[PDB]
């Protein structure tokens, strides 16, 4: 299905720590990936069960300025 | 953002790492290819293409083992 996601892009280390933090302290997401890349820059994919969950996530989960938030969709 | 054609390959991480190294040799047939990742072993490789033409080519010349699940789809970017 074409799933709503967001990709968090930035420093690989900043992202690894953000992933731990998301996992330990935050709600409003279905799954989150390991840090990956297509090198000091990376990507973290977060999936949602709906557009409303993704919106709740973006209205309440603190994400660092240095990490870019790209909203989007992908087949999974 | 545009809907980009892709395929995900899912399977054993070793399998995927080997296949990914092979593929890196046939880079003509795809746009990009990710490092191996997983949902937080069952790894995943994402391959991107600049057209459905190029994807269909890829799928017609590349050999994928049966234990590696091919998932065709798209993603925005």
Short mmCIF file of C-alpha atoms in Angstrom, two decimals:
data_model
loop_
_atom_site.label_atom_id
_atom_site.label_comp_id
_atom_site.label_asym_id
_atom_site.label_seq_id
_atom_site.Cartn_x
_atom_site.Cartn_y
_atom_site.Cartn_z
CA UNK A 1 0.00 0.00 0.00
CA UNK A 2 1.22 3.56 -0.52
CA UNK A 3 2.01 4.47 3.08
CA UNK A 4 2.36 7.92 4.64
CA UNK A 5 5.86 8.37 5.95
CA UNK A 6 8.39 11.09 6.72
CA UNK A 7 12.12 10.88 6.05
CA UNK A 8 14.37 12.60 8.60
CA UNK A 9 17.63 13.51 6.89
CA UNK A 10 20.86 14.69 8.50
CA UNK A 11 24.08 13.70 10.25
CA UNK A 12 24.31 9.93 10.60
CA UNK A 13 25.15 10.20 14.27
CA UNK A 14 22.47 12.77 15.03
CA UNK A 15 20.00 10.44 13.35
CA UNK A 16 21.09 7.33 15.31
CA UNK A 17 20.54 9.17 18.52
CA UNK A 18 17.27 10.61 17.28
CA UNK A 19 16.15 7.02 16.44
CA UNK A 20 16.90 5.80 20.04
CA UNK A 21 15.13 8.78 21.50
CA UNK A 22 12.08 8.34 19.26
CA UNK A 23 11.88 4.67 20.27
CA UNK A 24 12.27 5.35 23.94
CA UNK A 25 10.30 8.58 24.45
CA UNK A 26 7.82 9.27 21.62
CA UNK A 27 4.41 8.00 20.48
CA UNK A 28 2.39 8.56 17.24
CA UNK A 29 4.28 6.32 14.77
CA UNK A 30 3.98 2.86 13.48
CA UNK A 31 7.56 1.88 12.84
CA UNK A 32 10.86 3.54 12.25
CA UNK A 33 13.77 2.32 10.25
CA UNK A 34 17.44 1.90 10.99
CA UNK A 35 19.66 4.67 9.76
CA UNK A 36 20.29 4.26 6.08
CA UNK A 37 21.72 6.14 3.10
CA UNK A 38 21.67 6.08 -0.72
CA UNK A 39 29.53 9.64 3.97
CA UNK A 40 28.26 11.49 7.03
CA UNK A 41 24.65 12.06 5.99
CA UNK A 42 21.78 9.66 6.43
CA UNK A 43 18.05 9.04 6.49
CA UNK A 44 15.56 7.69 8.97
CA UNK A 45 12.07 6.56 7.68
CA UNK A 46 9.13 6.78 10.05
CA UNK A 47 5.76 5.14 9.03
CA UNK A 48 2.25 5.94 10.17
CA UNK A 49 -1.08 4.09 10.18
CA UNK A 50 -2.79 7.21 8.93
CA UNK A 51 -2.53 10.87 7.96
CA UNK A 52 -4.03 11.75 11.32
CA UNK A 53 -1.32 9.80 13.23
CA UNK A 54 1.39 11.47 11.10
CA UNK A 55 -0.14 14.86 11.90
CA UNK A 56 -0.21 14.08 15.67
CA UNK A 57 3.46 13.04 15.42
CA UNK A 58 4.42 16.36 13.73
CA UNK A 59 2.38 18.40 16.31
CA UNK A 60 4.11 16.79 19.40
CA UNK A 61 7.40 15.04 18.81
CA UNK A 62 10.44 17.22 19.13
CA UNK A 63 12.86 16.91 16.20
CA UNK A 64 16.15 18.88 15.92
CA UNK A 65 16.52 21.89 13.62
CA UNK A 66 19.53 20.24 12.05
CA UNK A 67 17.47 17.36 10.81
CA UNK A 68 15.30 18.00 7.85
CA UNK A 69 11.73 16.59 7.91
CA UNK A 70 10.50 15.42 4.52
CA UNK A 71 6.83 14.39 4.44
CA UNK A 72 5.95 11.81 1.78
CA UNK A 73 4.73 8.33 0.90
CA UNK A 74 6.16 5.00 -0.08
CA UNK A 75 4.93 1.53 -1.07
CA UNK A 76 5.26 -1.02 1.75
CA UNK B 1 8.09 15.76 -5.06
CA UNK B 2 7.40 13.18 -7.66
CA UNK B 3 6.21 9.61 -7.50
CA UNK B 4 9.42 7.68 -8.32
CA UNK B 5 9.23 4.01 -9.45
CA UNK B 6 11.16 1.66 -7.13
CA UNK B 7 11.41 -1.89 -5.90
CA UNK B 8 12.20 -3.04 -2.37
CA UNK B 9 14.19 -6.30 -2.03
CA UNK B 10 13.64 -7.99 1.33
CA UNK B 11 15.51 -10.93 2.68
CA UNK B 12 18.38 -12.23 4.68
CA UNK B 13 20.92 -9.44 5.31
CA UNK B 14 23.87 -11.56 3.96
CA UNK B 15 21.86 -12.36 0.87
CA UNK B 16 21.06 -8.70 0.40
CA UNK B 17 24.60 -7.56 0.94
CA UNK B 18 25.86 -9.94 -1.65
CA UNK B 19 23.14 -9.11 -4.17
CA UNK B 20 23.75 -5.39 -3.57
CA UNK B 21 27.44 -5.85 -4.27
CA UNK B 22 26.53 -7.73 -7.47
CA UNK B 23 24.03 -5.07 -8.56
CA UNK B 24 26.54 -2.24 -8.01
CA UNK B 25 27.81 -4.00 -11.30
CA UNK B 26 24.70 -3.36 -13.53
CA UNK B 27 24.26 0.19 -12.14
CA UNK B 28 23.23 1.00 -15.65
CA UNK B 29 19.84 -0.51 -15.07
CA UNK B 30 18.90 1.57 -11.96
CA UNK B 31 19.02 5.06 -10.67
CA UNK B 32 20.09 4.55 -7.08
CA UNK B 33 20.26 1.84 -4.42
CA UNK B 34 20.30 2.13 -0.65
CA UNK B 35 22.47 0.56 2.00
CA UNK B 36 20.82 -2.33 3.73
CA UNK B 37 18.26 -1.34 6.41
CA UNK B 38 15.42 -2.80 8.54
CA UNK B 39 12.36 -1.76 10.56
CA UNK B 40 13.33 -1.46 14.22
CA UNK B 41 18.01 -10.42 10.16
CA UNK B 42 15.34 -9.18 7.82
CA UNK B 43 16.97 -6.49 5.82
CA UNK B 44 15.72 -4.37 2.97
CA UNK B 45 17.33 -2.79 -0.04
CA UNK B 46 15.53 0.04 -1.92
CA UNK B 47 16.40 0.53 -5.68
CA UNK B 48 15.20 3.62 -7.57
CA UNK B 49 14.73 4.19 -11.23
CA UNK B 50 14.32 7.19 -13.49
CA UNK B 51 11.44 5.53 -15.40
CA UNK B 52 9.17 2.46 -15.46
CA UNK B 53 10.98 1.53 -18.66
CA UNK B 54 14.29 1.30 -16.83
CA UNK B 55 12.70 -0.70 -14.00
CA UNK B 56 11.17 -3.25 -16.34
CA UNK B 57 14.61 -3.57 -17.98
CA UNK B 58 16.25 -4.18 -14.55
CA UNK B 59 13.72 -6.79 -13.62
CA UNK B 60 14.29 -8.45 -17.05
CA UNK B 61 18.03 -8.79 -16.91
CA UNK B 62 18.75 -9.14 -13.19
CA UNK B 63 18.58 -12.46 -11.36
CA UNK B 64 17.12 -12.45 -7.86
CA UNK B 65 17.07 -15.46 -5.57
CA UNK B 66 13.76 -16.90 -4.43
CA UNK B 67 14.49 -16.22 -0.82
CA UNK B 68 14.72 -12.43 -1.61
CA UNK B 69 11.18 -11.02 -1.85
CA UNK B 70 10.82 -8.43 -4.68
CA UNK B 71 8.22 -5.71 -3.89
CA UNK B 72 7.42 -3.35 -6.80
CA UNK B 73 6.05 0.10 -5.94
CA UNK B 74 6.85 3.75 -5.78
CA UNK B 75 7.85 6.41 -3.35
CA UNK B 76 7.82 10.20 -3.35
CA UNK B 77 10.98 12.13 -3.46
#
